Write an enzyme that holds these catalytic residues in place. Sequence first.
Site, PDB file in Angstrom:
ATOM      1  N   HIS A  14      -4.217   8.312   0.072  1.00 12.72           N
ATOM      2  CA  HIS A  14      -4.083   7.221  -0.888  1.00 12.72           C
ATOM      3  C   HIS A  14      -2.626   6.830  -1.106  1.00 12.72           C
ATOM      4  CE1 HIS A  14      -8.132   8.718  -1.614  1.00 12.72           C
ATOM      5  NE2 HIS A  14      -8.399   7.598  -2.261  1.00 12.72           N
ATOM      6  N   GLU A  51     -24.746   3.861  -2.335  1.00 11.50           N
ATOM      7  CA  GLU A  51     -24.392   2.583  -1.726  1.00 11.50           C
ATOM      8  C   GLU A  51     -25.250   1.452  -2.280  1.00 11.50           C
ATOM      9  OE1 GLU A  51     -21.785   2.246   0.559  1.00 11.50           O
ATOM     10  OE2 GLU A  51     -21.398   4.322  -0.037  1.00 11.50           O
ATOM     11  N   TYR A  64      -9.879   7.304  -9.604  1.00 10.41           N
ATOM     12  CA  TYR A  64     -10.742   8.481  -9.609  1.00 10.41           C
ATOM     13  C   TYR A  64     -10.847   9.087 -11.003  1.00 10.41           C
ATOM     14  CZ  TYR A  64     -10.745   8.390  -4.507  1.00 10.41           C
ATOM     15  OH  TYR A  64     -10.917   8.030  -3.189  1.00 10.41           O
TER      16      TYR A  64
END
Lengths: 97, 597
Positions: B487, B357, B497
Amino acid sequence: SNNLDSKVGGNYNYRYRLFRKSNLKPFERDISTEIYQAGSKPCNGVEGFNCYFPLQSYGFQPTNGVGYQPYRVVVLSFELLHAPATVCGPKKSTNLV
Amino acid sequence: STIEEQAKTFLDKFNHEAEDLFYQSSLASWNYNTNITEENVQNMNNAGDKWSAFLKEQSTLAQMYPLQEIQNLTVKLQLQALQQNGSSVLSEDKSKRLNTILNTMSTIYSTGKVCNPDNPQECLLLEPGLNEIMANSLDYNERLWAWESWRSEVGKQLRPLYEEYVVLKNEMARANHYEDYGDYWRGDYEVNGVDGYDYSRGQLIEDVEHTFEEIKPLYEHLHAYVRAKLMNAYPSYISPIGCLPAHLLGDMWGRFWTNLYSLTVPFGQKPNIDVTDAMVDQAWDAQRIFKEAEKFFVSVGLPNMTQGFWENSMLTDPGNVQKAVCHPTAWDLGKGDFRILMCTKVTMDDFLTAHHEMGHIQYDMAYAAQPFLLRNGANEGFHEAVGEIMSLSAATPKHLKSIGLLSPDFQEDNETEINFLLKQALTIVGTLPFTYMLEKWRWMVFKGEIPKDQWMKKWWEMKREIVGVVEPVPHDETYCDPASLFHVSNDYSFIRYYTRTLYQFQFQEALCQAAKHEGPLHKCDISNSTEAGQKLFNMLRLGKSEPWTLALENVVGAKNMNVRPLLNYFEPLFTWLKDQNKNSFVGWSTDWSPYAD
């Protein structure tokens, strides 16, 4: 002055010019609301295609960063002219022997 | 004077107004995620609708500036975002019907559940029940019931909804000068008006096809290895030369083999790298896990965080009365105000997630000085690819030994490296062809090559050829497996991805050369290398003001996806998978199924 002048939603009392038909001079000031013209057509006092209202308000919010927070700036310019000196600094003193 | 002043002036007007309005929706989302309440959720939607309406009203002037004879790349990219109408090209009935489909598809997918045939009173929901059956439970019957019932209860219902989703979306994309909505997703990487760095929309199709064949030598050897291990646990259903069943992949959609690590351990006797016990003895907490993580970011030479960054971030769940979203999310509130939401615990899983993050923040903080329309990533790949390279280096034991969590006496040998390295290939190598499979199928559906009745027929065929996977039970034309993915039902792109996966190793190879690492990339550690973070920031600060191909050319040495750094990462694994596959067949055989007779 982030803890003093910022307001929830931005301090709209502080504004600045984004566009001008010409550059200013040293220590020049201009508060005109003339629409910045780019094309040949007249703006008719309203912005839009090739027309833009030059002044805009500041986004001084309490959540601003170091680069966006408000800074109370003061410029101190000094003048040395033919006329006599009207302002000076303080002089030192001591006891009386 | 000229027409150039209009665009430079209009964009500054939008870059001034869209800046503050957009942040009102971001901070409104922060307030909701930090305190899930009926009051915050209303301001979140009202703020988004307010900013969303401003984007459409502004397009009236963005379209009056033709970009035909203009060469300024800054003017073209910014106005092109507003000139596109998107869903506004169709009528309100078609646009509203589309959202009614997506809202209904998300509900059917979310509220899915399966009761056992022997226990009709015990239905397990999508989360946390059925995910545990495919991930943790090893029972053959439970994994089969959760798979086949999910396709019949959730897959069949989404088939008629997925039909309206495709035809409505294709009309939107075609109105915006596209071939189909499949090409619309490919438009994320489009580049026009730059010599030597241009990029066509359909070029992504040849790229995934080219890189797929280069992945096959590494994938076919891993597929035979996992098949051999799963064959020992399920010998009455898995042949030594056939395909892997779909319900034994480790999830409800067949994307990752990460959950199959317990069944495919290279060496179950040797230890692994884990600093869970090491951190608690040092009395580490959520703040210290974040603080020492910052030392790695400063050690590589990246900018450090602001005092308000740590002070206003979330480190735990503040009570159930004001329960927050504990999911990791890197937030950009604006005006230099960046924050992270995370319910961090003392464990290595949160140690690397914090670096992940924090890496997202380094991405956004780099190009934060760009204009508002250009204050975004060049593509979805760059956004998430840079996040993993910082955490993978932190996961290297060389960094843990320097920090002092992993003791210095911890031995390192080729046996232990395969335990970690093979575990990643189950996630990377066991997912790369699966993303290429889904997007290739969907791209053919949006274009219209596969009829709506032949969805399940071609989906099963692509599974046997590309990935070498077979269903546990035969499905007729009424089923729709890929529509049951998150998705897909929520109108999200899954090709990112694949691009993020290959871009991850590409950027890692560029930094490992900067930090002067020798050997395969799995032992790379850019910690304490000031040149590593310095070269990265030169790319992070570009944002979307230049072509993404230009960013890759001067950093990773390529203008598109490439498989070379992937094999470099899994170089010794290819020797291990080869040795394990000596008693099995490499690849797969499309003639085998678990229900064959």
